[PDB]
Structure formats: C-alpha cells, structure tokens
Design an enzyme around this catalytic site. Structure first.
Site, mmCIF file in Angstrom:
data_model
loop_
_atom_site.group_PDB
_atom_site.id
_atom_site.type_symbol
_atom_site.label_atom_id
_atom_site.label_comp_id
_atom_site.label_asym_id
_atom_site.label_seq_id
_atom_site.Cartn_x
_atom_site.Cartn_y
_atom_site.Cartn_z
ATOM 1 N N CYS D 85 0.797 -1.009 0.139
ATOM 2 C CA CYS D 85 -0.007 -0.071 0.001
ATOM 3 C C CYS D 85 0.777 1.322 0.067
ATOM 4 O O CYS D 85 0.898 1.968 0.821
ATOM 5 C CB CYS D 85 -0.970 -0.026 1.226
ATOM 6 N N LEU D 86 1.831 1.394 -1.225
ATOM 7 C CA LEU D 86 2.579 2.308 -1.161
ATOM 8 C C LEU D 86 1.899 3.567 -2.070
ATOM 9 O O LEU D 86 1.620 3.046 -3.078
ATOM 10 C CB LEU D 86 4.131 2.263 -1.797
#
Lengths: 314, 76, 608, 146, 76, 76, 76, 76
Positions: D85-86
């Site tokens: 979840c960058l």
C-alpha cells in the site's frame, strides 16, 4: 483405522487388547520405564482428540455408555419394560465390573512403576482434566469435548486410590495434607476455579503471605479425584438430564409428520425415509435413556462412589 | 471484587469484575466459562435490563450482588 | 400478451394507437420505485414531469407497458429462476453432499438432519423436474413464437419513438441522429427493463434446437434497434449494452459450419449494414472505462463477444470488408485507436492466464493431501474460468490480427504502433516457446481453451503477412529486450512435432524473416558502438540515451527528447520533476545541444 | 527502443553506491528482479530478512512495477499476496523515482498507514492492540523471515 | 447522482447515492432492491475493500463510477 | 511568515504562518478558505515528501516559498 | 578479489577472496576475522541466501559486491 | 546451559542461561515467546518459588533442569 468401531460389542477383540497390556504391566522393569514412550502424552491437542491420539486412549475409553452399545442392546426392543431393560443391565454390568478391575490392575502397577512413572501418570490425568471445563455448561460443545463415557470411566477408576487412605478405620487422615493449597497449584488448574469464602485478591497474597513444597502423590490424587468427580460424571448426569426432555421432544414430532396427508409419489418415499431414521433415532435415544439409568442403578458402583463421598467428607 | 450470576438451570458461576468495567467488559468474561458468544448475552438485574455500553457502577451493583443470566429467543 | 398483437399487427398500422408520450405524466398503475431509467436521473425526471405542466385515459397504452413489465418481472423472472435452477441444480448437488458426506452417526441431530436434507432433496427433484418441464414448453415453438412476435412488434414500436418524425416502419430514419441533453426526447426517460427483459429472453432461449429464432422471417427487426443503440447517446448503462453485444455474438455465432441466423439479415438490411461496423468499432474502445481488471465478467467478456463478431464477419460477407478498408483508408485516426487498445490487452493476457493456471494447479495440489476449503474450490473454479477466458480472448484477438494484416498491412505500420506491435509479438513468442508453456502441462488443455500450438501458428502468420515491411523488421531488429534468432528455430521444431501446422514453405518464409532481421539488428550494434560513445550530460535523464531532438522542459529547465516527453505527457500533463502544468506547446527545443551532438557524432566519425 | 537502458544504469547505481539495508538486481532475466530488505530494529520485524519477487512492467520508468512478497508478514498494509500500500506507485508515480527510491519507500514500511486496511483484522489490532501486534509480528518473523 | 454495481451473475442494479452517504448508508439501499441483509454486505472497488463507517467521498467514487457487489463465505 | 500554496491547476491563496508552527497548523490555514480536511493534507517539496505531523522548523519553510497542495486519494 | 560483507549492525568489512572459494570458506574467513560462529551466519546477496556447499562463481559474485550477513540468534 | 520449563497447559520450551542470570532476567526471557507480564513472575523449582532478586547460582540448577511455568496470577 482397522477396528475404528472400538466398542464393547466385539467381545472377541477388547479382551485380547486388554490381555496384550496384561503381560507388559506385570514386569517391574517394564513398568518403571513404560511411562516415557512416544505417543504417551497428547499434543494443545484437540479436546475431542484425546480419544484417538495417545497411548491409553483407545483401551480405557471402553465403557457401556457408548451410543452404538446402547443401540445394539436396547435399540432392538425400544418399548421394553423395566425387567427387559434390567436384563440388559444385569448382563452388561458384570462385564463392566470385569473390565474395570482388569484395567485398575494396569494403573496400579503404572502408579507403582517408578517415581517418574507416578508423576507422569498424575500429569497425564491432570492434563485431560483441565481441558474439559466446558463440560459444566448448559449446552456444552459435546462434539468438541471428551466423551462422557471416557470421563466417567476414569472417574470411578481413579477413585479406587482413595479408599485406602479413606479407610473405614480412618487412620490415614494425616496422610493427606490439609495444607495442600498453600503453595500455588502444580498439576490442577485454578483458572476460573471459584473459591469458598475468599477472593483472588486475598488468594494471591496468601500464596505469598506464607512464603514457604514436599512432593507426595497421595494428596494430588485425592483432590484430582474430586475434580474428575465434578468435571466428569457430575457433568454426565446433567448431560443426560436433558435427554429425558429430548425423548419427549423427539416423540413430539413423531405424529406431527404422520398426521399430514402422506399421498405423494416420491416425496412420500422421501418422507418415509425421513422417519425410518427417526424411529431408529427414537430407539437410540430410548436406549441411551434406559442404559444410563441402569448403571446408575448399579448399586455396587454407586455404593463405592458414595463411600468415597463419605470418606472425603470425613 | 467478585459477583454472582445464575442461568435457567440454577448453576451459579461467579466471576471477578471491576467497577470500571462495562457490561460488555464483564460479558467478555462469559464465553470463557460457559462458551456463549456475546451475541446472545442478556443480563437482567432487579427486573431491569442493562445497557450495553454502560459500566459496572452504572447500576449500583455492590459487592456480593446478584445478576441473572437469562436468554432471549435466540439459539436453536 | 395477446392484447398486444392487434396493435402489433404485421401490417403495422396501429402504431399511432400506443402513445409514446405515455411517460410524460407520472405513473398511474405501474411502479417507478426502483425503476432505473435509460439515460437520465431522478433529478431530471421529476423536473421534466413538471417541466411540461400538462391526461387522456386509454387502456391500450397501459396494457402495452404492463406487457413488458410482466415480461421482465414475470417469465423473465421464471427463466432467471430456472436458468439459475440449471446451475442451481449443481449448487443443490453441492449443498446436498455438504450434508450427506459428513458423519451422520448422531442420535437425534442426524435424525433431524436427515429430515432437513429431505426438504432439500424435495427441492432438488423440484429443480430437476423444472428443468425437465420448463424447457419443454420453451421447446413449444408456438408459445415462444408468439413471445418473439411480441418482441419484434414492441421493438418496431419503440424504434419509431427515437425517430424524430417516427417515420418507421412506413419509412427509414437517418443514421446516426447526431451529451447529457443530446439524448432524444423522450426515449431517455423510459423504464430500463423494457430493454433488459427482451434481451434476457433472447439470450437464454437460444440454447435449444427449436428456439424461436431458428429460421424465423419475422426476426431481425429488433436487430436494427440494437444497431441503432450502438448513436451512443441513446442509453447510459454499459452493462446492458454488453448484454446486447453478447446477444449479437450468438446471433452471428457459426455445429457444421452453418451460417449464423442473423448473417443474412446482417447482410441484407440497409438500416444495419450502413452503420453497424462503425458502431461496435467505437464501442470496443469505451468499455475499458468500466474500471480496471479485478475479476471475471469484466469488459474482457464484452471484448470477447465484440471481437468474435468481426472474426466471422470478415470471413463470410465481403461488403463489410470493403467498408472496413474504406474506413482504414479514410478515418484511420478512428482505426488506429481501436488497434492500439486491442494490442494493449495482449501485453498481459497470456501472462495472466499462465499465472492463473499455475494458481489452479497450486490449489489442486493443496487439496488431495494424502499426508475456506470449499471456498478455495470456488476460487479454483473462478480461476480456471478466468484462465479459460484469457486464453480464448488471446486466441480470438490474435486471429483477428492476421486477417487484417493480410488485407491492409499499411495500417499496422504507423510509427506510434509498430514498435508496440513488434514488442508484443516478440514477447509472446518468447513466452510461448519458452519453458513457461513447456513445463506447464495442463490436464486436458482442450477444456481450459488453452490451445498453444494453434495460437503459435497464428502468431507465425502475423509475422509472415507484414514480413516484407522495412519499418516492421527495423522495429523488430530494435527490440533489445526479447529478441533472439533461436526462438524461431525452436518454433520450427515445435511445429515440426505435430507436422502439418505450417508448410515447409511457411518455415522457409519465417526463417527468411528471421535471418533478414538479424543483419538490421547487427548493424545497429556497430552504429551504436564504433560511432557511439558514452559522454556525459548528452543523455536523457529519463532514458539515458542521446537525443536526436533534445528539447528544453519549461518547468524543470532540463533537456529531453521529444519522444520521451510525449510518452510522459500521454499519461499525465505534469512535469516529471516539479509537476508544473505541462503542455506540448509550452516546450522549447534545444538547438545548441543538438548541434553539439551532431559534432560529437562527426568526431566519432573521425575516430573511424 | 527505450525500455531496457534505464534498468542497467539503475542497477549499476548499486555498484557505484551500495545501499544501507537493502540490495537489488535480477536470475538472468532483465525484467525479473529479486530485492532485499531487513526488518528494522525499532520494529517487531527485527530479526527478519525478506525475499522479494519483482517483475517490471512494459515501462519501468513510465509505469510503476508491481511487486510481490515471498516471505509472509503480519502487517495491516500487507496481505498474503505481498501487495504494498505504497501511495507513490499509483498516485504520484514520477518517472524520476528510482528503484532505489522505491526500495526506500518500502523500507518506510515500520510506519503503518491505518486508513489503508489491506487486512482489516490486523488494522484494528494496530488501532488498539499494539502489544499483541508486536508479539505476533515477531512470531511470524521468526517463523518465515529467518 | 447515480452509480452502478454488479453481482457475480452479471446483474447491474443502479442506485442513486450522495457524496455525504457512508458505506453503510448506501448498503442500506441494497436490501430494498435485492433483499440482502447488510450483515453480508461486502463491497470491493478497484480491488480494495471499503471501510464500513467511511463516507462516499472517501473513495473518490465519481459520477458514473463502478462498484462490485461481491459476497463473503456467508449464506447457506 | 507568508507562505504561498498552489493546487494542481494553478489556483493559489495567500496565508500567514509563524516560523515555529506545525504543518498541520499551516494546514489549518489551508482549510480556512476551501475547508480541506486534514486527511488530504499533502505537501510536495522538490521530489521529496513532507509528513503532516511535523513542524515548520522541520520543513524549512523559508520566506515567500511556494508549497504544493495536491488532493489526496488515499486508499489501498 | 575484494568484496563487501555487511553484518546486521551495518558494520562493513572488505574480504579478499577468490571466486573459486566456497561459501563455507568465506564463513570460515568471517569467523577468523571476527570470531562470529558460522552456524549463526546467514549471507544475503541480492535477496538470496547462499549455501556453504556452493561457490562464489555459482551465484555470479563479482568483486566489490555487497553481501549481507544475518545472525540468527535467540537470547531466550 | 539451556533450561526447560513447562506450563499448566504443557508447552515445553527452552532458554539458554548462565549461572549468574537473575530470575527476573530469565522471566524477561519468556514473554518473548509467551507474552507474559513479568510482574506476575512465578517460577517453581523443587516445589519452591524462585526468589526473584537472587540469581540462579544459589539454586542447585543443573544441565537441563526442569521448571514449571505457572504464573496464572489471574485475579479474574
């Protein structure tokens, strides 16, 4: 796997299985080390998996209470009178007495094996005990708890160690220490163990307040006896206490599905198959209800249990 | 401190509780001793129900008080 | 439905009897709560109710729409409940064994469970007899014939309402008629089920040999409605247009190579052939806007149907082929975007399919452990279906490539597409002839639509058709990433295993191409090495290559070549460093560094 | 035409200046990389070194590379599929962001983002049950990331 | 405005929604048109789950966007 | 401290700050005009990132230095 | 040839070895140069754990490469 | 010099130790795997509790000496 139906019906199997242990147990050199082998202890193991995942579990689990035994004995004549079912009782209770005595002979030498042997057996019983506290609920997870036949068998089995120090002469009273609950527990669980007239706040402090421890099998066995009494067949009697209500509940729908117009082609055949199993279910519920009652009416066994009650009270 | 509670069949399971603890806080100590999910956890004291989020000291439940573990029409 | 055919007469004289203005006032007998609309919202709906501000009672019009309502909510509901009860039959078979495979050795719980499963088996026999019954009167080619007659008549009714003069069926409608207001009053406010019902009925009913469409002359009238649907302003929901195109698929789907039952109508109707290919040509673009690739039943199935149409449409009828050639030669701007969008999908279709086949094998190896659970098996079913869909889509899309390359190879040679096409073809070749497909041995690949060497044949033919284009081979010579002459050699033996897939002269042509590209590949190495060195500050910061046309970025004040910044700008109109508002007009060329690079190459010429 | 030559220089930047807690590079495929990261000391991951599977897209510079995990972890912003979840890759993906910079942003994961609950069971635990979160994260660290 | 959603079988039930409305707010408009209790209401958008309490504008769901009414291992 | 801020399209506002303030307090003068929630408080500074939680002495916000405000679309 | 070996502390040591040498030889050199037990030694190269039965030429280990050493240990 | 310790539920475990290790140090070497509060330290050797302040040396602990991890201390 091969003899998975390890009930008491096959009178030509379990006798041989018992005799198989009967020879090992005799030799003193065998007993002093028989307690440390593979498969002796269980795993954190599933509570219902103490039946088939350890050494002793497959032999001492034999007891008349098992469902198929009742189906095979009283499920034939479901509407039998008291004398007819008392015949089944007086027939089977003798075999029950024989097996109880045979395997008590095992466990005696097991305790009389060696110091580590008797410690190991005490631990092995205690571990099975403390993972069955769910037995004392209104609707316990029966499919996820040790079969009450097993938990009842072990009860009157280990109850035998009590009567020597519970002698009718009452001379071995000082043998069991009344200070047994000064130190914290060693083998029995106290999580959720309600107390008599004290709280946990005083309990933990009083544990320390003495601040000092002399091992002895006898005292541990005495209290484990009561523990298995309560968590065991004490649970069983309530477990069957709803069975009598369940018999009326099962008979309630027996005429409910027969009072309808049964005039279908194949839905009628399915409905008839739906009560062909239901009448067998009635004959099995009645078998269980008329089988648990008789061995309760086995005056010898209850006599021994009550003797233990009186002695412990003394 | 410790308090009491009884089911329909008469069994009396005690359990320690704290004045700060909410009703769900105590009901979380119920499935451990009887295996009942709090979805059906129904408490009656003196004939009046207990609010879910309310704390223990919200019903003047003193030491050695009494609860009544009753059940709704759920289960079965 | 019987009241319909008098006003739905085959003479079609009572069209004016049913008022198309029936939805100007609010409803009187039918419900609109939850009545999704065509191409308008409730906000415009309630205002337009008032916007007219005035009402002539008539049974006929109310009955006409109640007919469609009972069509959808009614026997449409029946077919959905039963077409279900075809797959729900297998679901019932699963839930029954969920209760029968378990240990039934309880005393009274198993007794109750047997009675519980008896009700489920009664429902199971109910479903089996529904399957053996409803299909019977669906095979009743009179009832279905009457229903389809009503469908055709109602369609004939509704198509005049979109015609501003309503000249049909007494005349034709100019096509197309041409965003949120451009929809023709008042078709947009009509209930949506009036379309969903009939299309559902047609889609489901066409799975039997005595289906009503089989050799029916009245059929095809609403095909015009479908084609007219695809002015794009007519409706708004895409997922029923997907149903429409899926219908058209089976409508042109070829047992014994029999012609599709709409092929004559698709080739003998002025109102259709004039604008059909343009319509779904445009439509193949838009469905990518319906989100990204998460699960099945996505726009890819819409692509599957929208493609296997042309797949045979070029085959049988040649007039559409000439139309396509005219299109590609005239408004090629329309055509290039279509080619690009479909080229794009192939970049990961085969990769994803191989990935999901490996996932299916992984799930299969997790179970059968001889040393949720059924939710994992539903996952296995969904992944196997996804892999089959991906493989089939790849197959159909590639098959489309070759027949257009053979006819109009000059379309593929546009500069902005040729590099991409060559890269994709080479990567697919490597992915296939590589060990990824060799080791992946699928049990019965004919089931999961994975037909590898057949696809290899088409891939080879793709190279073959345009193998005589200098720019194409030059692009293939310039794929430093996945170029190797040995891939074609491996392909030769792989096709030689199952002989007859390609001709010996086919092998000769492909090997000719493979050799001919090798020299163009080699010469670029000497051009880049002997006369190309590695200086500093002459390299594109985002590409690390010398710029033939270095330009100055007005935001970051950096130099870059036009191609790199054009590629960056197509994804976002923002500078890569400071994200200033960047447009191609704001850029500035760099002449001094361009001339210095020319001088650098001249110096490199002085070296050799 | 343009795709490969960025990757070689991004890789050789490792040889010119090796990283602190990581490493990168390919097997033999150019677009198939295997990265490295070691669990931060000030985090329950401590004692953990991770195996990474990387496949570059059609354009590593112009598109964000999808990255997957080989070693299982117990973190809210990570599922069993190694999805990261960058927020840089999908929203503010600049062409100038190096693979090393992306590895640095991964090393920033440590700081968990609660508004992105890839595994909500772990997300709520991070919301309230940090002690057991830290215990179980190290449990799985010793289980998988030896 | 209005948005879309689709089940496993492909049905595409539209429903008006508002930017202020939470995920449970929109899911309250689901059992009315499909008869599904919100206990199994499972929403996926762009491959990522949605928080129960969060509002509509918390996932930048624009006009004419797409949802995906998927279901968990519940029901049956 | 007068610090300028501009969105993606080029619109800007004029806001005041102090050297020892926090970025959220600087952000507190960003929701004064539009009403931008702190969840979308994104700051961009020359290819790097500026977390909301820190202070102005950590963001080295000089005199009349323009920062970048971009709407956040978080979620994953 | 010289290479770089990194420990968990970040301490960097240059080890002068040859490609023909085995990983066991390298770990013996590490134990000689620092005393660290080889059984606790876990070498990492580009996200790969090496094998003492294998050699440097097997995994394309060039000189001046960086190797990460991991010490698997438990105080408890 | 590692030791074995068993709990009430029977979870055997090992922990390397020293003659000079304090009892609280040993206990701190337990919650690493079991997550026990060190304030409720209760270790049992030879039927005796371990004086926390002292070290292992004043007890005749030998190689693979057995301990019992009974620290319930459950006020509940």
């Amino acid at each position: 796997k091969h003899v998975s139906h390890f009930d008491l019906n096959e009178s030509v199997i379990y006798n041989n299985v018992l005799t198989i242990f009967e020879l090992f147990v005799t030799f003193k050199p065998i007993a002093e080390i028989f307690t440390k082998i593979d498969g002796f202890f269980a795993d954190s193991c599933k509570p219902q998996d103490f039946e088939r995942k350890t050494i002793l579990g497959p032999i001492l689990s034999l007891s008349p209470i098992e469902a198929a035994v009742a189906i095979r004995n009283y499920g034939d004549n479901l509407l039998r009178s008291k004398q007819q079912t008392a015949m089944i009782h007086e027939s089977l209770q003798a075999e029950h007495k024989v097996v109880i005595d045979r395997l008590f002979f095992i466990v005696d030498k097991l305790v009389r094996g060696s110091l580590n042997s008797r410690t190991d057996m005490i631990s092995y019983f205690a571990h099975i005990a403390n993972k069955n506290h769910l037995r004392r609920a209104d609707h316990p997870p029966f499919k996820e708890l040790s079969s009450n036949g097993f938990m009842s068998n072990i009860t009157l089995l280990l109850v035998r160690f009590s009567q020597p120090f519970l002698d009718i002469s009452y001379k071995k009273i000082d043998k069991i220490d009344a200070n047994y609950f000064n130190n914290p527990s060693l083998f029995i669980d106290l999580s959720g163990e309600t107390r008599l007239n004290s709280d946990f706040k005083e309990a933990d402090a009083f544990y320390d307040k003495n601040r000092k421890s002399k091992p002895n099998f006898i005292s541990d066995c005495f209290f484990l006896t009561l523990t298995y009494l309560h968590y065991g067949l004490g649970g069983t009697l309530s477990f069957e206490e709803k069975m009598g209500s369940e018999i009326k509940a099962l008979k309630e729908e027996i005429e409910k599905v027969k009072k309808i117009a049964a005039n279908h082609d194949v839905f009628a055949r399915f409905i008839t198959a739906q009560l062909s199993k239901m009448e067998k279910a009635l004959k099995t519920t009645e078998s269980l209800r008329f089988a648990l009652q008789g061995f309760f009416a086995h005056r010898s066994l209850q006599l021994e249990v009550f003797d233990f009650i009186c002695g412990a009270s003394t | 401190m410790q308090i009491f509670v009884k089911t329909l069949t008469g069994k009396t399971i005690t359990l320690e509780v704290e004045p700060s603890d909410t009703i769900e806080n105590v009901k979380a100590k119920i499935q451990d001793k009887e295996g009942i999910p709090p979805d059906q956890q129904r408490l009656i004291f003196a004939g009046c129900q207990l609010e879910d989020g309310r704390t223990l000291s919200d019903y003047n439940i003193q030491k050695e008080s009494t609860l009544h573990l009753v059940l709704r029409l759920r289960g079965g | 439905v019987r009241f319909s055919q008098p006003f739905l007469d085959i003479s079609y004289k009572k069209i004016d009897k049913i008022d198309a203005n029936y939805f100007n006032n609010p409803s009187l007998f039918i419900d609109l709560s939850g009545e999704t609309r065509l191409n308008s919202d409730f906000k415009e709906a309630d205002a337009f109710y008032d916007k007219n501000r005035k009402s002539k009672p008539n049974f006929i019009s109310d009955c006409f729409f109640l007919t469609l309502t009972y069509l959808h909510y009614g026997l449409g509901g029946t077919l959905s409940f039963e077409e279900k009860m075809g797959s729900e039959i297998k679901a019932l078979k699963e839930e029954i064994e969920k209760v029968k495979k378990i240990a039934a050795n309880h005393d009274v719980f198993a007794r109750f469970i047997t009675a519980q499963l008896s009700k489920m088996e009664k429902a199971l026999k109910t479903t089996e007899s529904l399957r053996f019954a409803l299909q019977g009167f669906f095979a009743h080619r009179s009832l279905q014939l009457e229903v389809f007659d009503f469908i055709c008549g109602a369609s004939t009714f509704l198509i005049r309402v979109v015609d501003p003069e309503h000249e049909f069926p007494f005349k034709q409608i100019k096509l197309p008629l041409i965003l949120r207001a451009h929809a023709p009053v008042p078709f947009k406010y009509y209930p949506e089920f009036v379309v969903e019902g009939p299309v559902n009925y047609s889609l489901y009913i066409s799975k039997y040999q005595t289906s009503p469409i089989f050799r029916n002359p009245r059929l095809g009238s609403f095909v015009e409605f479908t084609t007219m649907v695809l002015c794009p302003e007519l409706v708004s929901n895409p997922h029923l247009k997907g149903k429409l195109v899926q219908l058209l698929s089976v409508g042109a789907m070829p047992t014994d190579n029999s012609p599709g039952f709409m092929m004559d109508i698709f080739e003998h109707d002025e109102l259709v052939n004039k604008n059909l290919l343009y319509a779904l040509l445009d439509f193949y673009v838009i469905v990518e806007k319906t989100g990204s690739s998460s699960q099945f039943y996505d726009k890819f199935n819409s692509r599957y149907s929208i493609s296997i149409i042309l797949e045979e449409l070029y085959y049988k009828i040649p007039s559409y082929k000439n139309q396509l050639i005219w299109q590609s030669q005239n408004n090629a701007d329309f055509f290039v975007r279509f080619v690009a969008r479909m080229l794009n999908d192939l970049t990961f279709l085969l990769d994803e399919g191989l990935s999901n086949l490996a996932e299916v094998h992984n799930i299969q190896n997790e179970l059968d452990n001889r040393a949720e659970d059924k939710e994992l098996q539903t996952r296995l079913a969904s992944a196997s279906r996804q892999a089959k869909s991906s493989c089939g889509l790849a197959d159909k899309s590639m098959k489309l490539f070759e027949i257009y390359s053979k006819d109009i190879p000059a379309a593929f040679v546009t500069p902005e597409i040729v590099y991409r096409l060559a890269s994709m073809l080479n990567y697919n070749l490597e992915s296939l002839v590589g060990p990824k497909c060799g080791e992946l041995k699928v049990k019965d690949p004919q089931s999961y639509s994975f037909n590898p060497k057949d696809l290899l044949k088409a891939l080879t033919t793709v190279y073959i058709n345009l193998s005589e284009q200098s720019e194409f081979i030059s692009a293939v010579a310039k794929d430093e990433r996945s170029f190797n002459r040995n891939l074609f050699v491996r392909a030769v033996d792989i096709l030689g295993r199952k002989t007859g897939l390609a001709s010996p002269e086919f092998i000769e042509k492909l090997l000719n191409f493979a050799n001919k590209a090798e020299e163009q590949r080699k010469a670029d190495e000497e051009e880049d090495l002997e006369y190309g060195d590695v200086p500093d500050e002459f390299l594109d910061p985002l590409m690390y290559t010398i710029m033939k046309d270095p330009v100055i970025l007005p935001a970051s004040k950096m130099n870059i070549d036009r191609s790199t910044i054009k590629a960056h700008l197509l994804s976002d109109s923002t500078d890569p460093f400071n994200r200033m508002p960047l447009k191609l007009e704001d850029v500035t060329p760099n002449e001094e560094l361009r001339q210095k690079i020319l001088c650098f190459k001249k110096q490199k010429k002085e070296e050799a | 035409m343009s795709s490969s030559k960025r990757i070689a220089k991004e890789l050789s930047d490792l040889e010119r200046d090796p990283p602190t807690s990581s490493s990168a590079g390919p097997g033999d495929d150019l677009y198939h990389w295997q990265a490295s990261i070691m669990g931060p000391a000030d985090s329950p991951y401590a004692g953990g070194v991770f195996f990474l599977s990387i496949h570059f897209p059609t354009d590593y510079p112009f598109k964000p590379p999808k990255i997957s995990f080989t070693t299982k972890i117990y973190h809210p912003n990570i599922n069993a599929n190694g999805n990261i979840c960058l927020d840089i890759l999908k929203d503010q993906w600049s062409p100038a962001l190096t693979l090393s910079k992306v590895l640095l942003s991964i090393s920033s994961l440590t700081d968990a983002n609660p508004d992105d609950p890839l595994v909500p069971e772990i997300a709520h635990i991070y919301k309230t049950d940090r002690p057991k979160y830290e215990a179980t994260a190290r449990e799985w660290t010793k289980k998988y990331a030896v």
